Amino acid sequence: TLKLHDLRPARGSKTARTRVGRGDGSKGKTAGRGTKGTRARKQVPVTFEGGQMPIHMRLPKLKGFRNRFRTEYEIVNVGDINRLFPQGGAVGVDDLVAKGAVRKNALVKVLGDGKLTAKVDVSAHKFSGSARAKITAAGGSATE
Amino acid sequence: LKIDVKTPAGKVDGAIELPAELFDVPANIALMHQVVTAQRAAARQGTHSTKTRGEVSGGGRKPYRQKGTGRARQGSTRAPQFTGGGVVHGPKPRDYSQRTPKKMIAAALRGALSDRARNGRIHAITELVEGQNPSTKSARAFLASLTERKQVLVVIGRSDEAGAKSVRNLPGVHILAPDQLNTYDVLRADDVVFSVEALNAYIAANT
Amino acid sequence: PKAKTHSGASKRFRRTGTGKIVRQKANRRHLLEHKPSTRTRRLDGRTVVAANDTKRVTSLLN
Amino acid sequence: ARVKRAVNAHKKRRSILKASRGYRGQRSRLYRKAKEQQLHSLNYAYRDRRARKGEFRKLWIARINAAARLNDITYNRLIQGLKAAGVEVDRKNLADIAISDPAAFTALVDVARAALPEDVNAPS
RNA sequence: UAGACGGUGAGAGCCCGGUACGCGAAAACCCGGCACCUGCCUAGUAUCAAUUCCCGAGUAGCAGCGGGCCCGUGGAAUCCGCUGUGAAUCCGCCGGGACCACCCGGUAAGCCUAAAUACUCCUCGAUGACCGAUAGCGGAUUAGUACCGUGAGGGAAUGGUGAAAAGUACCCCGGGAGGGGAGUGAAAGAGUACCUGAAACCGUGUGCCUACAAUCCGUCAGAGCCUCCUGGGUGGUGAUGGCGUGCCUUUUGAAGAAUGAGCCUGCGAGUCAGGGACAUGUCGCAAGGUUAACCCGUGUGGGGUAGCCGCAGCGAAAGCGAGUCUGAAUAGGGCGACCCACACGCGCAUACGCGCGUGUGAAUAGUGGCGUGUUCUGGACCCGAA
RNA sequence: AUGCCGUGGUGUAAAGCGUGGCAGUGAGACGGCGGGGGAUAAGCUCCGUACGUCGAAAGGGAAACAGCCCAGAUCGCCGGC
RNA sequence: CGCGGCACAUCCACCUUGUGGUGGGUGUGGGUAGGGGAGCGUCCCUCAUUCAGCGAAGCCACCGGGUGACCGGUGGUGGA
Ligand SMILES: [Mg+2]
Ligand SMILES: [Mg+2]
Ligand SMILES: [Mg+2]
Ligand SMILES: [Mg+2]
Ligand SMILES: [Mg+2]
Ligand SMILES: [Mg+2]
Ligand SMILES: [Mg+2]
Ligand SMILES: [Mg+2]
Ligand SMILES: [Mg+2]
Ligand SMILES: [Mg+2]
Ligand SMILES: [Mg+2]
Ligand SMILES: [Mg+2]
Ligand SMILES: [Mg+2]
Ligand SMILES: [Mg+2]
Ligand SMILES: [Mg+2]
Ligand SMILES: [Mg+2]
Ligand SMILES: [Mg+2]
Ligand SMILES: [Mg+2]
Ligand SMILES: [Mg+2]
Ligand SMILES: [Mg+2]
Ligand SMILES: [Mg+2]
Ligand SMILES: [Mg+2]
Ligand SMILES: [Mg+2]
Ligand SMILES: [Mg+2]
Ligand SMILES: [Mg+2]
Ligand SMILES: [Mg+2]
Ligand SMILES: [Mg+2]
Ligand SMILES: [Mg+2]
Ligand SMILES: [Mg+2]
Ligand SMILES: [Mg+2]
Ligand SMILES: [Mg+2]
Ligand SMILES: [Mg+2]
Ligand SMILES: [Mg+2]
Ligand SMILES: [Mg+2]
Ligand SMILES: [Mg+2]
Ligand SMILES: [Mg+2]
Ligand SMILES: [Mg+2]
Ligand SMILES: [Mg+2]
Ligand SMILES: [Mg+2]
Ligand SMILES: [Mg+2]
Ligand SMILES: [Mg+2]
Ligand SMILES: [Mg+2]
Ligand SMILES: [Mg+2]
Ligand SMILES: [Mg+2]
Ligand SMILES: [Mg+2]
Ligand SMILES: [Mg+2]
Ligand SMILES: [Mg+2]
Ligand SMILES: [Mg+2]
Ligand SMILES: [Mg+2]
Ligand SMILES: [Mg+2]
Ligand SMILES: [Mg+2]
Ligand SMILES: [Mg+2]
Ligand SMILES: [Mg+2]
Ligand SMILES: [Mg+2]
Ligand SMILES: [Mg+2]
Ligand SMILES: [Mg+2]
Ligand SMILES: [Mg+2]
Ligand SMILES: [Mg+2]
Ligand SMILES: [Mg+2]
Ligand SMILES: [Mg+2]
Ligand SMILES: [Mg+2]
Ligand SMILES: [Mg+2]
Ligand SMILES: [Mg+2]
């Protein structure tokens, strides 16, 4: 039988911790710092480049604003609707949340990647043009 | 698969089926090691503390002037190099509980129970004592007829007090509730004995 | 605690779909009269951050 | 888990002082001073294990040359003579038989003289 | 129903205190009930109609100067303070981030309000991969004592005979101290200087060497003595020959006459926290993964979907979307998609294949855990100013 | 003349390159060769040099003697060149 | 160069032909800052097992052992 002492970590899962400053045979006196300057006793902030204007100050801000009022859509593609719904049928926001192609409690829009071979009746928010094109081409319907 | 229920002071009354997808999971040694070490880490209470140089009593003044005394400059009587001074990087109270995922816990449980079932260290019993008054003597005798080796888990429902009291005092006997089953305890025990309702509760809770 | 991302870096760099860090280029803000259109068009748009700035830039953004 | 250091710490101290027995002054009494002298002692021993290979061969050549000029040959030409005669007896045993069996050494000188070229000084 | 724990002459469930468990309170306090008591109601209700009045002031608003909010005065909204000015009572007034209109929401300038939250001088009960006398509280000990300072303040050090004092009667040397013999004790190789009793350091005895030699003190070569075992081998010593410029730090470079170290013992420096960040190792699940708080459990177990990351990108953005942005462009460029190995299954190429689907990777592709390196914020490897 | 760029052959294990993790270093010294400054002084100073050594390299030689010459110590040998 | 021991890298052939072992080649193994890899010793916990008042720990001496940190045996002291 398998006891508590037949139990063992996976090979390479438990690596040893490097104990610094513990004699000459290992990472010895200076503990890998090697130095006499700032780095010998302190940290240099990532934002500091010795005094020239740093990279985060030489360059211009990215242009534009972010729209406070942006409407974000979860994305489903008719390809993955075909994948998840091979027999077609009624397709709803809740249905493809349940099957896992879209996050819950979000507006979802259908996009036109992939093929549609399923007679599908998809009820989503704000389809794509190619999405409606191939949804109706497969014989289905695309409804808000 | 087919474990027969043994009655205290008597013969087998029936048998109970032990689902494969739940008592025949392959044993994953690395998984169960992870889960058991997380379990013992959570068991550790971690109330170990020392006192840094700022928490040590006194030590406020610079003990003497920096220059001219011929001594090493010191700054504080409670610096770590002083005897009675602060402890540098000493233990502070810690919580060692880990966040092992639920299905890792569950897989470790099924691996350990499956390992017990696979070489027949799992039994089911109707009761530990046939009566209501708890008796350690009869519980011990019946457990000894059941298994003759030192470390037994007994899984009994919370609503059985007589069996719990009558096995509570035996060395090597560890009592768990079915919802409290865990890899460390099953892996410590070399024999796991369920009551019928405890085992059925475990199977029902695990579908 | 929780790490704070660098504000100026977050307004000067962004990531693309595949994870590349992009940036706009300097010298297009003013004194544009003497700058010929070839230079302003060279300076237009976004470029991927240099390979040996990548590590510090990622550290700033993270 | 506070750990006292002494039990582990004293092991290397015992080894160093035991190795430093016979040293004079603090170098046999004090671990810090014994350890410095142990570094020197082991450096010296390492140096001298490969130096004695030259030291013993220096001594062997000295003895060989002394025996050779008792038999009226320089070590210079005796080594040629043995090379040319094909005698591959090394100087360890050449010196040791120059001491233990001088007549055999004289025989070796004779074969070396014979193997020497007639005009040891003209080009070959 | 007791195998908690501790003590007892050494590891005790059965020797003791106890433990599981079961009982237990004059009185006091706390808690609850019944009374007694106190307070409220026994007169309003419905409808009509909207003619009248009511809603909390030096307040709101406004202006100035400030404060505070993510907002560092900015177009400054909301909130607070002072100064000035200074309303209106619902067909009012306030808010909805300048402002206006509309619309929506609410009724400031009176007060009170349990619970969920914070904390532990203190009391019980437990606990510890906490410390164990330089540690742990400064404080196991006269401990905030001694001592230092005028004072505020600062602030120590000091534990262990033995199971039991059975703590050495008596005798002898000695003024005593101390010791010797006796005696007690398992042990005095435990004698109130006391468990164990290391090192530095100090003797005494003893084997070898050493008073003509210039020595980083060793090392290699090496005679001779001494010792202990069977000429030989150990162990000690070392006449004599060669070689040989301490250790650390820091330096172009130090044996350096640069730094630090009298010696020994003890202590004294990359640690921990966080669903932090990056990268990796490993494990789980996998187009999913995982919970947080919290809830329920004697636990480490079971729940818990809020959330987070992955799932589509491009664009300043509206937006469009396997595309998208720029652009007049069916121009060019930028960014993004063409996701993997093995296999089958199809719409079929003679059997060998484009695409698309199951599967199997239980590293796929992510995600979560755990380990490691680095990093962030914290004292952040430790010590040190003026 | 060298050096440099490309190219085709030949040769050469621990070349090169990309991309990540972790660095240290950013006080150099002397010697050779080419130069500047200096007084064609300096154990001077400043450059160049698919130059070397030291740095961070012990061993052998140079009396001693980081930087010159020989030669790069895995360990052992009372073997040899 | 010779003879013997070790190690690292890589290559070739057998064995569950990569978790990798074995044999044999070939090359390599001075080193500060520094990187990577693999270990020794101390303490504590868990599991298993095994010693211990017929004497544990600690300490001391001696004899042995390992490529290193170090380890073992025997005896003395000691008392958990
Ligand atoms: Mg050091
Ligand atoms: Mg540095
Ligand atoms: Mg420096
Ligand atoms: Mg330093
Ligand atoms: Mg400047
Ligand atoms: Mg303080
Ligand atoms: Mg201070
Ligand atoms: Mg303290
Ligand atoms: Mg949970
Ligand atoms: Mg502009
Ligand atoms: Mg222009
Ligand atoms: Mg000596
Ligand atoms: Mg030689
Ligand atoms: Mg007990
Ligand atoms: Mg105002
Ligand atoms: Mg303000
Ligand atoms: Mg009002
Ligand atoms: Mg009110
Ligand atoms: Mg109130
Ligand atoms: Mg409250
Ligand atoms: Mg409380
Ligand atoms: Mg208490
Ligand atoms: Mg103390
Ligand atoms: Mg006083
Ligand atoms: Mg006496
Ligand atoms: Mg006596
Ligand atoms: Mg007696
Ligand atoms: Mg004793
Ligand atoms: Mg004493
Ligand atoms: Mg004593
Ligand atoms: Mg003399
Ligand atoms: Mg001399
Ligand atoms: Mg000598
Ligand atoms: Mg240097
Ligand atoms: Mg200098
Ligand atoms: Mg000095
Ligand atoms: Mg000196
Ligand atoms: Mg100085
Ligand atoms: Mg000094
Ligand atoms: Mg965007
Ligand atoms: Mg394009
Ligand atoms: Mg994985
Ligand atoms: Mg850790
Ligand atoms: Mg400091
Ligand atoms: Mg500089
Ligand atoms: Mg410089
Ligand atoms: Mg230079
Ligand atoms: Mg010149
Ligand atoms: Mg110079
Ligand atoms: Mg030069
Ligand atoms: Mg040299
Ligand atoms: Mg030399
Ligand atoms: Mg010389
Ligand atoms: Mg020769
Ligand atoms: Mg090396
Ligand atoms: Mg070499
Ligand atoms: Mg190093
Ligand atoms: Mg005894
Ligand atoms: Mg004894
Ligand atoms: Mg111990
Ligand atoms: Mg020993
Ligand atoms: Mg022993
Ligand atoms: Mg002992």
CSV table of N, CA and C (backbone and C1' of nucleotides) in Angstrom, one decimal, chain E residues 24-50:
chain,number,residue,atom,x,y,z
E,24,G,P,-26.7,18.7,40.0
E,24,G,O5',-25.9,19.7,41.0
E,24,G,C5',-25.5,19.2,42.3
E,24,G,C4',-24.4,20.0,42.9
E,24,G,C3',-24.5,21.5,42.7
E,24,G,O3',-25.4,22.1,43.6
E,24,G,C1',-22.3,20.8,42.2
E,25,A,P,-26.4,23.3,43.1
E,25,A,O5',-26.6,24.1,44.4
E,25,A,C5',-25.5,24.2,45.4
E,25,A,C4',-25.3,25.6,45.8
E,25,A,C3',-26.2,26.7,45.1
E,25,A,O3',-26.5,27.7,46.1
E,25,A,C1',-23.9,27.1,44.6
E,26,A,P,-28.0,27.8,46.6
E,26,A,O5',-27.9,28.6,47.9
E,26,A,C5',-27.8,27.9,49.2
E,26,A,C4',-27.5,28.8,50.3
E,26,A,C3',-27.6,30.3,50.0
E,26,A,O3',-29.0,30.8,50.0
E,26,A,C1',-25.6,30.0,51.1
E,27,A,P,-29.5,31.9,49.0
E,27,A,O5',-28.3,33.0,49.0
E,27,A,C5',-28.2,33.9,50.1
E,27,A,C4',-26.9,34.8,49.9
E,27,A,C3',-26.9,35.6,48.7
E,27,A,O3',-27.5,36.9,48.9
E,27,A,C1',-24.9,34.4,48.9
E,28,A,P,-28.1,37.7,47.6
E,28,A,O5',-26.8,38.2,46.9
E,28,A,C5',-25.9,39.1,47.4
E,28,A,C4',-24.7,39.3,46.6
E,28,A,C3',-25.0,39.7,45.1
E,28,A,O3',-25.3,41.0,44.9
E,28,A,C1',-23.4,37.9,45.2
E,29,C,P,-26.5,41.5,43.9
E,29,C,O5',-25.8,41.4,42.5
E,29,C,C5',-24.6,42.0,42.2
E,29,C,C4',-23.9,41.4,41.0
E,29,C,C3',-24.8,41.2,39.8
E,29,C,O3',-24.9,42.4,39.0
E,29,C,C1',-23.6,39.2,40.2
E,30,C,P,-26.2,42.6,38.1
E,30,C,O5',-26.1,41.4,37.0
E,30,C,C5',-25.1,41.5,36.0
E,30,C,C4',-25.1,40.3,35.2
E,30,C,C3',-26.3,40.0,34.4
E,30,C,O3',-26.5,40.8,33.3
E,30,C,C1',-25.5,38.0,35.3
E,31,C,P,-28.0,41.2,32.8
E,31,C,O5',-28.6,39.7,32.4
E,31,C,C5',-28.1,39.0,31.3
E,31,C,C4',-28.8,37.7,31.1
E,31,C,C3',-30.3,37.7,31.0
E,31,C,O3',-30.8,38.1,29.8
E,31,C,C1',-29.6,35.9,32.5
E,32,G,P,-32.0,39.1,29.7
E,32,G,O5',-33.3,38.1,29.9
E,32,G,C5',-33.5,37.1,29.0
E,32,G,C4',-34.4,35.9,29.6
E,32,G,C3',-35.7,36.3,30.1
E,32,G,O3',-36.7,36.5,29.1
E,32,G,C1',-34.7,34.9,31.7
E,33,G,P,-38.0,37.4,29.3
E,33,G,O5',-38.9,36.5,30.2
E,33,G,C5',-39.4,35.3,29.8
E,33,G,C4',-40.2,34.6,30.9
E,33,G,C3',-41.4,35.4,31.5
E,33,G,O3',-42.5,35.4,30.6
E,33,G,C1',-40.2,34.4,33.2
E,34,C,P,-43.6,36.6,30.7
E,34,C,O5',-44.4,36.3,32.0
E,34,C,C5',-45.1,35.1,32.3
E,34,C,C4',-45.4,35.0,33.7
E,34,C,C3',-46.2,36.1,34.3
E,34,C,O3',-47.6,36.0,34.0
E,34,C,C1',-44.4,35.6,35.8
E,35,A,P,-48.5,37.3,33.8
E,35,A,O5',-49.1,37.6,35.2
E,35,A,C5',-49.1,38.9,35.7
E,35,A,C4',-48.7,38.9,37.2
E,35,A,C3',-48.8,40.2,37.9
E,35,A,O3',-50.1,40.4,38.4
E,35,A,C1',-46.7,39.2,38.3
E,36,C,P,-50.9,41.8,37.9
E,36,C,O5',-50.1,42.9,38.7
E,36,C,C5',-50.2,43.0,40.1
E,36,C,C4',-49.1,43.8,40.7
E,36,C,C3',-48.9,45.3,40.2
E,36,C,O3',-49.8,46.2,40.8
E,36,C,C1',-46.8,44.2,40.1
E,37,C,P,-50.6,47.3,39.9
E,37,C,O5',-49.4,48.2,39.3
E,37,C,C5',-48.6,48.9,40.3
E,37,C,C4',-47.3,49.4,39.6
E,37,C,C3',-47.5,50.4,38.4
E,37,C,O3',-47.8,51.7,38.9
E,37,C,C1',-46.0,48.8,37.8
E,38,U,P,-48.8,52.7,38.0
E,38,U,O5',-47.9,53.1,36.7
E,38,U,C5',-46.7,53.8,36.9
E,38,U,C4',-46.0,53.9,35.6
E,38,U,C3',-46.8,54.4,34.4
E,38,U,O3',-46.9,55.9,34.3
E,38,U,C1',-45.7,52.5,33.7
E,39,G,P,-48.2,56.6,33.8
E,39,G,O5',-48.1,56.4,32.2
E,39,G,C5',-47.0,57.0,31.5
E,39,G,C4',-46.8,56.4,30.1
E,39,G,C3',-48.0,56.5,29.2
E,39,G,O3',-48.1,57.8,28.5
E,39,G,C1',-47.1,54.3,29.1
E,40,C,P,-49.6,58.3,28.1
E,40,C,O5',-49.9,57.4,26.8
E,40,C,C5',-49.3,57.6,25.6
E,40,C,C4',-49.7,56.5,24.5
E,40,C,C3',-51.2,56.6,24.2
E,40,C,O3',-51.5,57.5,23.2
E,40,C,C1',-50.5,54.3,24.6
E,41,C,P,-53.0,58.1,23.0
E,41,C,O5',-53.9,56.8,22.7
E,41,C,C5',-54.0,56.3,21.4
E,41,C,C4',-55.1,55.3,21.2
E,41,C,C3',-56.4,55.7,21.8
E,41,C,O3',-57.2,56.7,21.1
E,41,C,C1',-55.9,53.5,22.3
E,42,U,P,-58.3,57.6,21.8
E,42,U,O5',-59.5,56.6,22.0
E,42,U,C5',-60.2,56.0,20.9
E,42,U,C4',-61.1,54.9,21.4
E,42,U,C3',-62.2,55.2,22.4
E,42,U,O3',-63.3,55.9,21.9
E,42,U,C1',-61.1,53.2,23.0
E,43,A,P,-63.9,57.1,22.7
E,43,A,O5',-62.9,58.3,22.6
E,43,A,C5',-62.9,59.2,21.6
E,43,A,C4',-62.1,58.8,20.3
E,43,A,C3',-62.1,59.8,19.2
E,43,A,O3',-60.8,59.6,18.5
E,43,A,C1',-63.2,57.8,18.5
E,44,G,P,-60.2,60.8,17.7
E,44,G,O5',-61.0,60.8,16.3
E,44,G,C5',-60.3,60.4,15.1
E,44,G,C4',-60.9,59.1,14.6
E,44,G,C3',-60.9,58.9,13.0
E,44,G,O3',-59.7,58.6,12.5
E,44,G,C1',-63.0,58.3,13.9
E,45,U,P,-59.3,59.1,11.0
E,45,U,O5',-60.2,58.3,10.0
E,45,U,C5',-60.2,56.9,10.1
E,45,U,C4',-61.4,56.3,9.2
E,45,U,C3',-61.5,57.0,7.8
E,45,U,O3',-60.5,56.5,6.9
E,45,U,C1',-63.6,56.8,8.8
E,46,A,P,-59.8,57.5,5.9
E,46,A,O5',-60.7,57.4,4.6
E,46,A,C5',-61.2,56.2,4.1
E,46,A,C4',-62.4,56.4,3.3
E,46,A,C3',-62.4,57.6,2.4
E,46,A,O3',-61.7,57.4,1.2
E,46,A,C1',-64.5,57.5,3.6
E,47,U,P,-60.8,58.6,0.6
E,47,U,O5',-61.7,59.3,-0.5
E,47,U,C5',-62.6,58.5,-1.2
E,47,U,C4',-63.9,59.3,-1.6
E,47,U,C3',-63.6,60.7,-2.0
E,47,U,O3',-63.2,60.8,-3.4
E,47,U,C1',-65.4,60.7,-0.4
E,48,C,P,-62.2,62.0,-3.9
E,48,C,O5',-63.1,63.2,-4.3
E,48,C,C5',-64.4,63.0,-5.0
E,48,C,C4',-65.3,64.1,-4.7
E,48,C,C3',-64.8,65.5,-4.8
E,48,C,O3',-64.8,66.0,-6.1
E,48,C,C1',-65.9,65.3,-2.7
E,49,A,P,-63.5,66.0,-7.0
E,49,A,O5',-63.0,67.5,-7.0
E,49,A,C5',-64.0,68.5,-7.3
E,49,A,C4',-63.8,69.7,-6.4
E,49,A,C3',-62.4,70.2,-6.2
E,49,A,O3',-62.0,71.0,-7.3
E,49,A,C1',-63.5,70.2,-4.1
E,50,A,P,-60.7,70.7,-8.2
E,50,A,O5',-59.6,71.8,-7.8
E,50,A,C5',-60.1,73.1,-7.6
E,50,A,C4',-59.5,73.7,-6.3
E,50,A,C3',-58.0,73.9,-6.3
E,50,A,O3',-57.7,75.1,-5.5
E,50,A,C1',-58.7,72.5,-4.5
